[PDB]
C-alpha cells in the first residue's frame, strides 16, 4: 500500500485585507496597524515639562499682565495656550507678534533679571485703571512707564552694557496717545521719539497721536518692540517722551522648547508624543491625529489606516 | 504568489494546524497525521519580525517647528508656510503607501518561498522512493510507519533502506 | 515514436526599451508613458470657472480702474492674468502687492458692498485726467478721493462696525503729492496723516511730498493699503488730509480659488487640470509641462519620459 | 530574469502566438500544433492591471499654491520660495524614477514566474511518462494524439493510462 | 535567501574558489577537481554593476540656495528656513535608508537565484544519468572522467552516450 | 564507482555587514560605501571660480571699504566669507542685509559703471577719520557723501535713465547724525529727506538725529538701501539733506553664483563639490559632511555610513 505525505501551510477563519503592489485587496492571516488614529484626549504632564497657560498667552506672561504674575521666571519644554485666554491690562499690539512669541517659546524660559537704569529727571512706575493688580491701578510688571517730573521731561540718554555670557532680550514700548490730553498729562509737552540702539542695531519709533476704538475703556495703545544685545555690546535708550521702558532683561536660551494651541486637559500620565488633541502612543511609525506635534512622534500622513501584513496569504478550506 | 505554492499547487491552507505555519500531513498504515515544521515556520517569522523591528518604536523627535494653523489672512508668508507643510505631508503620505505595498508584496512572496523550500527539501530527501502528485503530496512507494514519517520530518530518513522496496513498487506493471 | 511538448511565451517584432533596477535598457513586449508632456495649448473653460482678466490685473479690477468695470462682483475658481495687461488710471503702488493679490485670488470673489461713511465737512468724489471713464475725468470705482470743502479740511473721525458673519476687507490709500500745489489744491493746507485702526490693529501713514517720474503725465502717487475687520470689531478712519477712502468692503471667502499668469487662449472644452501652457490630460501620474498647475493634475517631474513595462521581456526569434 | 525561464532555459518567445502570453507547442503523429494557456496569461495580466490601477487616473487636487516664477530680484523670501519648489520637484522626480525602476523589475520577474509555474505544473502532471529536455520541452514516451495533448493542456491528463507504455519506452536499451 | 540555495541546500561557500562566484566541484576516478562557471558569475556581476551605474557618479548640481546657519535670533522667517531644510534632510535620509535596504535584499536574492539557475540547468543536462543528493551535489551513475565532467561544465554532455550504463547502475538491487 | 558533481559558490574570510529589509545585520562577500564622510580640509580653486573674501564681507567689497579696493569689478562662481572679516570704514547698517548679500552673491559680479549725476549746488566727496584710505581721511569708494556749498544745501532733483539691456542696481544711503552738530556741519540746516523713485517704485527715508554707541569713535550711522531700475525706466533722487548718493550702478546678472561662510584654506586642486569644511569627492550619492554645499555634490543625509552589498551572502567554511 505505501503512504501519502502532504506538505502544507496554515490558515485562519478570520483573515484581514491588505494592499499590495499588484492588488488593492488581498487576504492575509494576520496584519498590524501602522497609522495611529486615536488619543485619550489628555496631554500627559510627563516626561516633558508642561506649562499650562490657563488664562494667559505667552506674551501676556512675558509682559507681566497681572493675572499672569504666577508665571514669573518659569521654564517649560512645552507651553500650552488656551483659546479662552484673554488680556486684562493696557491695550497693546506687537509688530511681528508671531516672531516674538516664537523666539520666546523656543527659548523656553521667562527668567528675568532686574537692572537699575539711570532714570534721573522723570517719574517712574506710571499706572492705569485698565491694568488692575491687587485692587489697585497698576501696569505690566516687566515694563516701566516713565512720565514727567515737575512738568518737565528732559531728554533721556541711558546705557546698559552686556557683560554676560548670553544674549540679553530687552522688551520695551511706545505709548501712542489717544488724544492731546493723553500726551500732555504724562509727558507735559508735544512729542516723543524713542531710539533704542546697540553697536550693531538701531530701532527708532515715533508716537502717533490718534483715537483707536476703545479696549477696556482706553483709546490709546502701547506698541511693543524688542532688542537683543550680544556679549560685549551695549544697549542705549534715547527718549524725549512716550517710552515704556524695560525694568531689565530676559535670558534667551537654546533648547527643545516650544508652544502649542490646545484645549485638551493636562493629565497625570507619561507619554512622549503630544498633539493638540491629547497625547498619543508612539509605537506606530505614522499617525493621522494632527499635523501639529511635539516630542518623539509618528509622522503625520493623510491616510487613516495602513495595514502591514504579518502573515502569509490566507487560503481557507 | 511568485513561487506558486501558497494559493498555487497547494490548494488551500489548514485551519487545524495551529502550532506552526508550515507542516506535514500523512496517511500510512497506522492512520492519518499532522505535524508542524518548526524551522520553516521560524524562518518566515524571523523575517517578518525583521520588518517590524525597522518599523515599530523607531520614531523621530521634533520640537519647535513652524505654525500650521492660522486665524488671520496674511498672504505671501502664510502661503509659503502652508505650502511647505502640505508638500511635506504628501511626500510622507506617499512614502507610507509605497512602503506598505512593497513590504506586503514581499511578505506574501517570502512566505510562499518558505513553503516552496520545505517542499523541495522533502522531495530531494525521498530520492527515488516517492513521486510528486502535483498538489504538494508525495506518493511514497514503500511501507512507511510513524517512525519512518517522523524520520522524514526530522531529516534523518535514509532512502537506501527502502530503495529496493520502492523501485519494485514504482516500476511495476 | 511518442511526442514533444514545448512550453513557451509570446514575443513581438517591435519591442520597447524600459529602465530597471539592474539595467538601464531592457526590451519588453509593451509599455505605457507615465509622464504627460503635451497640451493642446488652450485653457479649457470647464469644469472650473475661469475668469479671463484680458487687459486687467486682479488688482486693477479690485481697485476699479475704468477698463475693468465689467469685473464688478465677479467670482472665479481661476483668475488668468495676461502679460499684455496694463493700468490706465491714477499711478499707484501697493506695499506687499504680492500678498494682496494672493489673498484676493485665494478668496475668489470681487463681491463689494457699499457703505455710507459719515464724510461731513469734506468734498467727495475727487477725479483726475489720468483716469478717464466714459470720456470724463474719473477715478477708481471702489475708492473715494476726499478734498476740501470751502478751503477747509477738518479732522475726520469716522467709524463703521462689522456686525456681519464674515471678515470685511477694506481697501484704502494715501495720496503722495508731487509738489506743494498738489497738496494745496485738494486739501488747502500743509500735511495729512491717516490712522486706520480696529480693536486689534492700527496702521498709520504719512504723505511724503515729492516728485516721482511721470506716469500718464502724473508725478504724484497713490499708495494702497488694506485692513481686515473681524465680526464684532469696528473700523476707525482718522484723517487730517490725503485720505483715499473706501466706499465699502469686499467679502473675503475661503475656497479653492487662485490666479495664474498665462497667455494661452480659453477654449470650449472640458479638462480638470490647467497649466499656463494650456490644459493637460490627467490620466498619467506625472507631467513635465509646467511646475505651475491648478486642479486635479499629475505631479511635476524633471524627466520628459518614464516608461512603465506592461509586458514581459521581449526575446524575438 | 530571476526565475530563469524567459530569456533563460526557454531560448526565445514565439511571434506567431498572438492569442495568449504563454502556451504550448507540440509535435505528435497528427502534426505540429500551438495553443495559448489562458489562466497563466490572465494571471500575469491581472497583476499588471493591478499596478496600472494604482498609477493611472489617481491624481491629486491642488488649488492656490505659492508663486513659482518672478520678474523681480527680491532676495531672501524669493530664495526660500524657489528653494522649496526646487526641493519638492527633486523629491518627486526621485520617487518617479525609483517607482518605475522597481515596478519594471517586478513586472519582468512576475512574468518570468508565470512561465515557470506553467512549466512546473505541466512537468508534475506528466509524472514518469516524460522527461525534461532542459529547453522547456518534454519528450513524452508514449503515443500522444491531439486529444491526449488537449488533455495535458486542460489539466485532465491521466498519467496511469499511459504509464506502462511510457516506462517500457523510457527504460529501454 | 528567497530561492533556498545560498545559505540553504548548499551548506557553505568555497573560500578556495577565487576565479569565479559560482562553480563546480567533482570527485571521479581521476581525482577531485574545482572549476568556476563564468556565465553565471558574469550574470550576477552585470546586474550588480547595473545598480552601481545608477548610484555612483550620478550627482546633482546645486548653486545658490537658502541660508542654513544663523548667528541671530530672528523668529518666523528663520523658523521656516530651518524647518524646510530639516524637512528635506529627513526625506532624503529616508530615501537613502530604504534604497540601500531594498537593493541589498535584491542583491542577496539575485545572487541566490543565479546559484539556483546553474544548479537546475546542470540537473536537466544530466537527465536520467544522475540523482540530486539534496546538498547541491549529484551522484552520477556512470564512469565520468575529466573530459566527461568538462563536457557537463561546457554544456556539451550527451546523456544518450551513458544512459544504458547509468540506468543499469541506478535501478540495480 | 561513478562520480560526484557539487555545485557551489564562493566565500571570503573577511565579510562585511549590511542592512536589509528583513535583517539589520547580514554578512555579504563585499560592499561599498554610499555616504561620503570626509574632506581633505581644503577648498579647491578649480573648476569653480573662487573669490576669497579674506578680511572683507561681500557687502564691504560692494560699498567699497578701503581694505576691499582689490575686489573692484571682480566676478565669482563662489564668494567665500571668512569669520575673521571686519569692517573698517564709517559705521553702517543695512535693513534686509541678508537679502542684499544674497542678491549680490547670486548675481556673481561687482562690475561697476560710473555715472555723472548733476550734483550742482552741493559739495561732493565728503570724507571721515573713520574710513582711512592710503593714510588720508576717505569714504566708501562707491558712495558719494554730499555736504553744503557756501552754507546752503538746496533741494536736489537729479535723474538718470536706464537705456541699457540689463537691470541696474543702485546702492545708496542716509546719514543719521549722532548730535545737532553732526547735522549742522555737513548740511548747515535742520533736517533731510530722501525720496528715491522710479516709474514703478518709491522709497522714502527720514534721518533720525540721535546718539548710537560709538563704533570706531563715531556715534552717527549710515543706513544703506538699494534700488533696481529696469530697462526703459528712470532713477529719480530727491533730497533736502543727508543723502549718501551713488556714484553709478552695478550690473546685475543671473547665473550659478553664490556665497559660503568658511574658514577652510583655498588649495591648488580640482574638485566639483565644495562644502565649508573643504571640498569633497562626488562619486558617492550621499554625504554627511555638511548640509551647506556648492556644485555637483552628493545629497546630505543624517546617516554616517550606508553599505551597499556588491556581493552575495557570505557563508564561510
Ligand atoms: C498578529 O501580528 C502581530 C505582530 O507580529 C502580533 O502582535 C504582537 O504580539 C506580541 C505577542 O502577543 C506582542 O508582544 C508583547 O509586547 C508587549 C509590549 O506591548 C506594548 O508595547 C508595544 C511597543 O513595543 C506595542 O506594540 C503594544 O501595542 C503595547 O503597547 C510586551 O510587554 C509583551 O511581553 C510579554 O511576554 C514576555 C515574555 O517573553 C514578558 O517578558 C513580558 O513581561 C510580557 O508578559 C509582549 O512581547 C506585540 O506587542 C504585538 N506587536 C504589535 C506590533 O502589535 C499578533 O500576536 C499577531 N496575531 C496573531 C493572532 O498571531
Ligand atoms: C500596451 O499596454 C497598455 C496598458 O495596458 C494598453 O493600453 C490600454 O489599452 C486598453 C484597451 O485597448 C485601453 O482601454 C480603453 O480605455 C478607454 C478610455 O481611454 C481614455 O481614458 C484613459 C484613462 O482611463 C486613458 O488612459 C486613455 O489614454 C484614453 O484617454 C475606454 O473607453 C475603452 O473602452 C472600450 O471598450 C469597452 C468594452 O469593454 C467599452 O465599454 C467602451 O465603450 C470602449 O469601446 C478601453 O477600455 C486603455 O486606455 C489603455 N491604457 C493605457 C494606460 O494606455 C495597450 O493595449 C497595450 N498594447 C498592446 C499592443 O497590447
Ligand atoms: C568590492 O566592490 C566594489 C564595487 O564593485 C569594487 O570596487 C571597484 O573596483 C574596481 C576595480 O578594482 C574599481 O575600478 C577602477 O576605477 C578607477 C577610477 O576610480 C576612481 O573613480 C571612481 C568613480 O568612477 C571612484 O569610485 C573611485 O573611488 C576612484 O576615485 C579606474 O581608473 C580604474 O581603471 C583601471 O583599469 C582600467 C582597465 O580596464 C584602465 O583603463 C585604467 O587606466 C585603470 O588602470 C578601475 O576601473 C572601482 O573604482 C571600484 N568601485 C567602487 C564603487 O569602489 C571592489 O573591487 C570589490 N572588492 C573586491 C575584493 O572584489
Ligand atoms: C466717557 C469718557 O470716556 N470720557 C473721557 C475720559 O475717560 C478721559 O479720561 C481718562 O479716562 C480713562 C478711563 O477710560 C482713565 O481714567 C484715564 O486715567 C489714567 C488711566 O488710568 O489710564 C490715569 C493714569 O494715572 C494715567 N497714567 C499716567 C502714567 O499718566 C493714565 C494716562 O495718562 C493715560 O491712560 C494715557 O493715555 O490715565 C483718564 O485720563 C478724558 C481724558 O481726555 O476724556 C474723556 O472724553
Ligand atoms: C507741462 C506740465 O506738466 N506742467 C505742470 C502741470 O501739468 C501741472 O498741473 C496738473 O496737470 C495734470 C496733468 O499732468 C492735471 O491736469 C492736474 O489736474 C488734476 C488731475 O487731473 O490730476 C485735476 C483734478 O481735478 C484734481 N483732483 C483733485 C481731487 O484735486 C487733480 C489733483 O489735484 C492732482 O492730480 C493731485 O496730484 O489734479 C493738474 O493739477 C502744474 C501743477 O503744479 O504744474 C506744471 O508744471
Ligand atoms: C571725546 C569726543 O569724542 N568728543 C566729541 C568729538 O569727537 C566730536 O567731533 C567729531 O569727532 C570725530 C571723531 O570721533 C571726527 O573727528 C569728526 O570729524 C569728521 C569725521 O571724520 O567724522 C570730519 C569730516 O570731515 C566730516 N565730514 C563731513 C562730510 O562733514 C565728518 C562729519 O561731519 C561727521 O562725522 C558727521 O557725523 O566729521 C568730528 O566732527 C564733537 C562734535 O560735536 O563732539 C565731541 O563731544
Ligand atoms: C472718534 O470716534 C470714536 C467713535 O465714536 C469716539 O470714541 C467713542 O467715545 C465715546 C465717548 O467719549 C465712548 O463712550 C465710546 O466708547 C467711544 N467709541 C469707540 C468705538 O471708541 C472718539 O471719542 C472720537 N475721538 C475724538 C478725539 O473725538
Ligand atoms: C524733478 O525732475 C523731473 C525730471 O526732470 C521733473 O519732471 C519733468 O518735468 C517736465 C516739465 O514739467 C515734464 O515734461 C517731464 O515729463 C518730467 N519728467 C519726469 C521724468 O518726471 C520734475 O518737474 C522736477 N520736479 C520739480 C519739483 O522741479
Ligand atoms: C549718550 O550716552 C553715551 C554713553 O555714555 C555717550 O557716549 C559716550 O561719550 C563719551 C564722551 O563724549 C565717549 O568717550 C564714549 O565713548 C561714549 N560712549 C558710548 C557708549 O557711546 C553720549 O555722548 C551721550 N550723548 C549725548 C548727546 O550726550
Ligand atoms: C481664568 O478666568 C476665568 C474667567 O474669567 C476665571 O473664572 C478663573 O478663575 C481664572 N483663573 C485664573 C487662574 O486666573
Ligand atoms: C537723545 O538724548 C540726547 C541727550 O539727552 C539729546 O540731545 C537728543 O535730542 C535725544 N534724541 C532723541 C531722539 O531722543
Ligand atoms: C484633532 O484636532 C483637530 C483640530 O483642528 C481636528 O480637526 C481633528 O479632527 C482632531 N483629530 C482627532 C483624531 O481627534
Ligand atoms: C522525530 O522527532 C520527534 C521529536 O521532535 C520525536 O518524537 C520522534 O520520535 C523523532 N523520530 C525519529 C525517527 O527520529
Ligand atoms: C484691450 O486693450 C487693447 C489694446 O489697447 C484694445 O485693442 C482692446 O480693445 C482692449 N480690450 C478691452 C476689453 O478693453
Ligand atoms: C483724529 O481725529 C480727531 C477728531 O477730529 C482729531 O482730534 C485728531 O487730531 C485726528 N488725528 C489724526 C492723526 O488724524
Ligand atoms: C510651458 O511654458 C513655459 C514658460 O515658462 C515653458 O518654459 C515650457 O517649456 C512650456 N512647456 C511646454 C511643454 O510647452
Ligand atoms: C480541451 O479543451 C478544449 C476547449 O478549450 C476542447 O476543444 C478540447 O477538446 C479539450 N480536450 C480534452 C481532451 O479535454
Ligand atoms: C571544456 O572547456 C575547456 C575550455 O574552457 C576545455 O579546456 C575543455 O577541454 C573542454 N572540454 C570539453 C569536453 O569540451
Ligand atoms: C587682514 O587683517 C589682518 C589683521 O588685521 C592683517 O594682518 C592682514 O595683513 C590683512 N590682510 C589684508 C589683505 O588686508
Ligand atoms: C524734491 O526736490 C524739489 C525741487 O528741488 C523740491 O521742490 C522738493 O521739496 C524736494 N522734496 C524732497 C522730499 O526732497
Ligand atoms: C563641518 O563643519 C561643521 C561646522 O558647523 C561641523 O559641525 C561638522 O562636524 C564638520 N564636518 C566634518 C565631517 O568635518
Residue numbers in the entry:
A (entry chain A), C (entry chain A), F (entry chain A): 9 to 325
B (entry chain B), D (entry chain B), E (entry chain B): 1 to 173
Task: Give excerpts from the publication.
The majority of human antibodies against influenza virus that are elicited by natural infection or vaccination target the globular head domain of the hemagglutinin (HA) glycoprotein. Subsequently, we focused on A/Brisbane/10/2007 (Bris07), a WHO-recommended H3N2 vaccine strain from 2008 to 2010 and a commonly employed model strain for experimental studies. Here, we structurally characterize an egg-adaptive substitution, namely L194P, in H3N2 virus hemagglutinin. Our results reveal that the L194P substitution substantially increases the flexibility of an epitope region that is commonly targeted by antibodies.
Crystal structures of Bris07 L194 and P194 in complex with avian receptor analog 3’SLNLN (NeuAcα2-3Galβ1-4GlcNAcβ1-3Galβ1-4GlcNAc) and human receptor analog 6’SLNLN (NeuAcα2-6Galβ1-4GlcNAcβ1-3Galβ1-4GlcNAc) were determined at 1.75 to 2.3 Å resolutions with 100-fold molar excess of ligand. The 3’SLNLN adopts a typical trans conformation in complex with Bris07 P194, but the 190-helix is slightly lower and the 220-loop shifted such that the RBS is more compact compared to the apo form. The electron density for 3’SLNLN in Bris07 P194 allowed us to model three monosaccharide moieties (Sia-1, Gal-2, and GlcNAc-3), whereas that in Bris07 L194 only permitted us to barely model Sia-1. Taken together, these results suggest that the binding affinity against the avian receptor is increased, albeit not dramatically, in the presence of L194P substitution, which is consistent with its role in egg adaption. The elevated mobility as assessed by conformational dynamics in the 190-helix of Bris07 P194 apo form appears to be diminished in the receptor-bound forms, as suggested by normalized B-value analysis. This implies that L194P substitution increases the entropic cost of receptor binding, which in turn may explain the generally low avidity against sialylated glycans. At the same time, the L194P substitution results in lowering of 190-helix such that a hydrogen bond can be formed between D190 and Sia-1. This additional favorable interaction may help alleviate the entropic cost during receptor binding. Secondly, there may be a high surface density of sialylated glycans in eggs, as suggested by the fact that eggs can support a wild-type-level growth of an RBS mutant Y98F that has a low receptor-binding affinity and is attenuated in vivo. These observations, along with the results from our study, indicate that a slight increase in binding towards avian receptors is sufficient to improve replication efficiency of human H3N2 viruses in eggs.
